């Protein structure tokens, strides 16, 4: 569900 | 314009009018009877989760140069970033809290609409988004369908279709290619002039409401109050 990797 | 609100639409209506064409909608009367809606207070979260370690994003926006990620207990997060006059914005974001703390899973339900997807229920990813007023998730797109369920507080949400991607100036780098270079609420229109005319939808998502974010739809989210949301990523 990440948008910040 | 505004995202439409529909009360408990049939699976077929949701499929034909929203899922297949990839159009956002807010579903009402679906999550308003999750036990979470009445149970989740700061006190309850502290009692059930307070001692567990969680990742915390510190900084206004994950696109900022000062932004960072750390680890702390849920009790520490609440004390430092919610209740005591916080020195910085902190956000317990994008975290599979329900796999970590199965007891909390009893308080939520996977929406029945997820069964319209071509994927396995065991592969649905459930994330918690818990933070103070003022958290911001910059405009970005994700590779799966999403139901974003609001439990506590309200969020201001802006949605831009994948057809508008050229006006959103995606970053070139690999780690940020799913993220816009534009600050939605204060865009640099000298550097990003195409953004000004790009059409969008917006809403204020309130407790008990579910926002359907179609796969690849660009979304920007700002918490207006102390907020707890639960996302379901599904295909
Ligand atoms: O609520 C937020 O800050 C962002 C939520 C999001 O990006 C997601 O659920 O995919
Ligand atoms: Mn997202």
Author numbering:
A (entry chain B): 139 to 143
B (entry chain A): 182 to 416
Article, verbatim:
JMJD5 is a JmjC domain-containing protein, present in both the nucleus and the cytoplasm. Building from an extensive peptide-based screen for potential JMJD5 substrates, our results provide evidence that JMJD5 is a JmjC-hydroxylase, catalysing the stereoselective C-3 hydroxylation of arginyl residues in sequences from proteins involved in chromatin stability (RCCD1) and translation (RPS6). Consistent with previous reports, JMJD5 residues 174–416 fold into mixed helical and β-strand topology comprising seven α-helices, 13 β-strands and 3 310 helices. Like most 2OG-oxygenases, the JMJD5 active site contains a metal centre, which is octahedrally coordinated by an HXD..H motif (H321 and D323/βII, H400/βVII), the 2OG oxalyl group and a water molecule, which is likely replaced by a dioxygen during catalysis.
We therefore pursued a site-specific 'disulphide enzyme-substrate cross-linking' strategy, which enabled us to obtain four structures of JMJD5(Q275C).Mn.NOG.RPS6(A138C), JMJD5(N308C).Mn.NOG.RCCD1, JMJD5(N308C).Mn. OG.RCCD1 and JMJD5(W414C).Mn.NOG.RCCD1 as cross-linked complexes (Complexes 2–5, respectively). In these structures, clear electron density was observed for the substrate backbones that enabled modelling of residues other than the target arginine (RPS6 aa 137–138 and RCCD1 aa 139–142). Compared to Complex 1, single sidechain conformations for the target arginine residues corresponding to 'productive' (A in Complex 1) and 'non-productive' (B in Complex 1) orientations were observed in Complexes 3/4 and 2/5, respectively. In the substrate complexes, the β3–β4 loop folds to enclose the target arginine region and active site. While all of our 'productive' complexes (1/A, 3 and 4) are consistent with those reported for other JmjC-hydroxylases in terms of the relationship between the active site metal and the oxidised C–H bond, neither the 'productive' nor the 'non-productive' complex structures appear to be consistent with stereoselectively favoured efficient metal-based backbone hydrolysis reactions.
